[PDB]
Amino acid sequence: LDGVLVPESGILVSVGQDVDSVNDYASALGTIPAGVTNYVGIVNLDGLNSDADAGAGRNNIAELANAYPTSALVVGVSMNGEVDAVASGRYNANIDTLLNTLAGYDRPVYLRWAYEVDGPWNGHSPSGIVTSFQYVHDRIIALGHQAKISLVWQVASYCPTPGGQLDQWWPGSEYVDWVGLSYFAPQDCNWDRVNEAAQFARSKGKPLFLNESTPQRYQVADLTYSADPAKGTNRQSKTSQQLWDEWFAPYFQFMSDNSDIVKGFTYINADWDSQWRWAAPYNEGYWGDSRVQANALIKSNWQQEIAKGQYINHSETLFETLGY
Numbered sequence: 334l335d336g337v338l339v340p341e342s343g344i345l346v347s348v349g350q351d352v353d354s355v356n357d358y359a360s361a362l363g364t365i366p367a368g369v370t371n372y373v374g375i376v377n378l379d380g381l382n383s384d385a386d387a388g389a390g391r392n393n394i395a396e397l398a399n400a401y402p403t404s405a406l407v408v409g410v411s412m413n414g415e416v417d418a419v420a421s422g423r424y425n426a427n428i429d430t431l432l433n434t435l436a437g438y439d440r441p442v443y444l445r446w447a448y449e450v451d452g453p454w455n456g457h458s459p460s461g462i463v464t465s466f467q468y469v470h471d472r473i474i475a476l477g478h479q480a481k482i483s484l485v486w487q488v489a490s491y492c493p494t495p496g497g498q499l500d501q502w503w504p505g506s507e508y509v510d511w512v513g514l515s516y517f518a519p520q521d522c523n524w525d526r527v528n529e530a531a532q533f534a535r536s537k538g539k540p541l542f543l544n545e546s547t548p549q550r551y552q553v554a555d556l557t558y559s560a561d562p563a564k565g566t567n568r569q570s571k572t573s574q575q576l577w578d579e580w581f582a583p584y585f586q587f588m589s590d591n592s593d594i595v596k597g598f599t600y601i602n603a604d605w606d607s608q609w610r611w612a613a614p615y616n617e618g619y620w621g622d623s624r625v626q627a628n629a630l631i632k633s634n635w636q637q638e639i640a641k642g643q644y645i646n647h648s649e650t651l652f653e654t655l656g657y
């Protein structure tokens with residue numbers, strides 16, 4: 334909290350966003366990720382101490398924390414459509430349990446509270462978001478966990494939502510440690526939404542975390558792309574180099590272009606297509622397959638990029654580098 338877990342320099346490399354996909358990445362790449370990512374819902378604390386699987390991969394923060402004891406923990410917290418009731422205090426015991434549990438892991442924790450704050454589908458009110466960020470920031474201090482938990486305000490940076498509407502969601506610089514964004518199909522509006530989020534973070538003097546990232550609508554194993562965000566029709570064959578150059582190269586270039594502020598990313602490395610929420614016939618959008626290990630060229634290029642010196646990977650000095 335209050336900036337102590339923001340690295341002075343470098344970009345935290347983390348992976349997500351379910352236990353099994355993270356394990357598959359770690360095994361396939363022969364690496365311990367520097368950060369690992371799961372989700373919990375505030376209403377039930379689903380996924381905190383036992384399995385939760387709502388079709389977007391299995392979440393189990395206890396299992397994940399035990400499997401990656403010397404990695405940073407990144408946790409998205411959904412309001413489950415109830416941010417106003419959360420702001421009114423109906424989930425305060427759950428908030429304390431969440432914060433106390435995460436602090437008990439004695440490691441850097443990056444907490445994406447009410448993540449995708451401005452995604453209309455989340456049913457948030459601006460007041461509920463602003464109030465609950467203030468509450469959680471202050472409660473972290475009251476519980477004595479300010480050295481352990483860093484509070485991320487993550488926007489959706491989603492092209493179909495009009496730009497210019499971020500201010501209403503902002504709780505104040507006193508209450509936020511990072512601005513976060515989602516990097517999926519930013520090319521659909523010429524990077525306008527992700528650039529707006531970056532510029533907002535920059536203006537506020539906050540570091541930027543790319544909290545959700547994936548080559549959305551691409552399939553790594555199949556080597557295809559679809560222009561259809563709903564159902565992935567009319568798939569087009571791509572070479573592996575094309576897939577790299579179309580999505581991966583501009584993703585890493587975005588970090589470089591925003592190197593004054595970018596201090597972390599979570600790459601979602603998963604066969605989305607195999608997870609029932611994201612599966613055929615695609616009732617909640619078309620996602621694809623983002624496993625870098627599913628193509629030799631993608632895997633090699635991924636490994637080569639993240640090995641570079643601007644990136645913070647796993648080592649014995651990781652926690653110190655992250656301010657822990």
Ligand SMILES: [Mg+2]
Nearest residue numbers: 334336337338
């Ligand atoms: Mg912090």
